[PDB]
């Protein structure tokens, strides 16, 4: 909507207070004009119609329980935009400041979130498995990273290319979480997963096997469920990414860590310059090696660590 940029205040899912960029025109809308061509957050009103209604608020104060998922989806979309702009010089998910749109309160008791090809979508969870999923900054950046992938490599959401697609979203979801620097970790969704259980998460990059996901190519899933295990086989790539950044020895293969920033540079370059819709795990290794060669040299430690890491997880 056409209006004037304003700044509201509210509370997120976890109860923290944050300022949000809004737009005033009769009502205060969750429309952030300070980033690209706008970040817009919508109310799906417990329905599955999308996008729903642009979030309208009467007083620019968002402290109601019903406001919390919208506050976080709006705010964490902004943080993710900042990450890609400041760190990778990327303007929104299409590189041309495309408007970013999110809907919260999707359906009833919906234990998931997703990017649907046009926008992010967040359920509220059932209160047992999940609380509203936009409360996890790694979840928000995960979904928005799917948009980035859609507009670059376009990895088909099936089998190994789909598992790469998922891993990419976990990697930068985690790197965004580290970028915001609030309780960062190498686990996915811990901030919104099972409020009754401390310390658990949906997935683990440091130890995917913690939740039954493979940490080595020899344990890859190859049935038909989960579009061929895209959320399962991602553990193989997540583990390799984790090893590249943090280092460690895995199935007897020692990896020298090079840190989060260099991981992000290598994998962003791989994503945006070398990966294609049909890339498999082996081609991802080649993409990452060539990327690290472009950035640091063919004889660099960075290249050697990429090779070590994929060796560790059994990808040649
Ligand atoms: Ca209000
Ligand atoms: Ca965390
Ligand atoms: Ca996390
Ligand atoms: Ca939990
Ligand atoms: Zn995903």
Swiss-Prot record:
The keyword Membrane does not apply. It catalyses: Preferential cleavage: Xaa-|-Leu > Xaa-|-Phe. Binds 4 Ca(2+) ions per subunit. GO terms for biological process: proteolysis. It is an enzyme of class 3 (hydrolase). Zn(2+) binds at residues 142, 146, 166. Ca(2+) 3 binds at residues 177, 183, 185, 190. The keyword Metal-binding applies. Thermostable. One of its GO terms (cellular component) is extracellular region. Ca(2+) 2 binds at residues 138, 177, 185, 187, 190. Its main location: secreted. Ca(2+) 1 binds at residues 57, 59, 61. Keywords: Calcium, Hydrolase, Metal-binding, Metalloprotease, Protease, Secreted, Signal, Zinc, Zymogen. Belongs to the peptidase M4 family. Extracellular zinc metalloprotease. This is Thermolysin. It comes from Bacillus thermoproteolyticus. The lineage of its organism: Bacteria, Bacillati, Bacillota, Bacilli, Bacillales. The chain holds residues 233 to 548 of 548 of the full protein.
């Amino acid at each position: 909507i056409t209006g004037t940029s304003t700044v509201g205040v509210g509370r997120g899912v976890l109860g923290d207070q944050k300022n949000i960029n809004t737009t005033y025109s009769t009502y205060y809308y969750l429309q952030d004009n300070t980033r690209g061509n706008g970040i817009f957050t919508y109310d799906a009103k417990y329905r599955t119609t999308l996008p729903g209604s642009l979030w309208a608020d009467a007083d620019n104060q968002f402290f109601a329980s019903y406001d919390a998922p919208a506050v976080d989806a709006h705010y964490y979309a902004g943080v993710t935009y900042d990450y890609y702009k400041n760190v990778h010089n990327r303007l929104s998910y299409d590189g041309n400041n495309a408007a970013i749109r999110s809907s919260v309160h999707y359906s009833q008791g919906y234990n998931n979130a997703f990017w649907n090809g046009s926008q992010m979508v967040y359920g509220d969870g059932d209160g047992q498995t999940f609380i509203p999923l936009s409360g996890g900054i790694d979840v928000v950046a995960h979904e928005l990273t799917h948009a980035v992938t859609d507009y670059t490599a376009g990895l088909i959401y099936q089998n190994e290319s789909g598992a790469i697609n998922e891993a990419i979203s976990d990697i930068f979801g985690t790197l965004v979480e580290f970028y915001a620097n609030k309780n960062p970790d190498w686990e996915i969704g811990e901030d919104v997963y099972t409020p009754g259980i401390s310390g658990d998460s949906l997935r683990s990059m440091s130890d995917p096997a913690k939740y039954g996901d493979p940490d080595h190519y020899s344990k890859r899933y190859t049935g038909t469920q989960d579009n061929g295990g895209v959320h399962i086989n991602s553990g193989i790539i997540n583990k390799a990414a984790y090893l590249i950044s943090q280092g460690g020895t895995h199935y007897g293969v020692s990896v020298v860590g090079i840190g989060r920033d260099k991981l992000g540079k290598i994998f962003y370059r791989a994503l945006t310059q070398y990966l294609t819709p049909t890339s498999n795990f082996s081609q991802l290794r080649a993409a990452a090696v060539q990327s690290a060669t472009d950035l640091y040299g063919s004889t660099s430690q960075e290249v050697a660590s990429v090779k070590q890491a994929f060796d560790a997880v059994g990808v040649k």
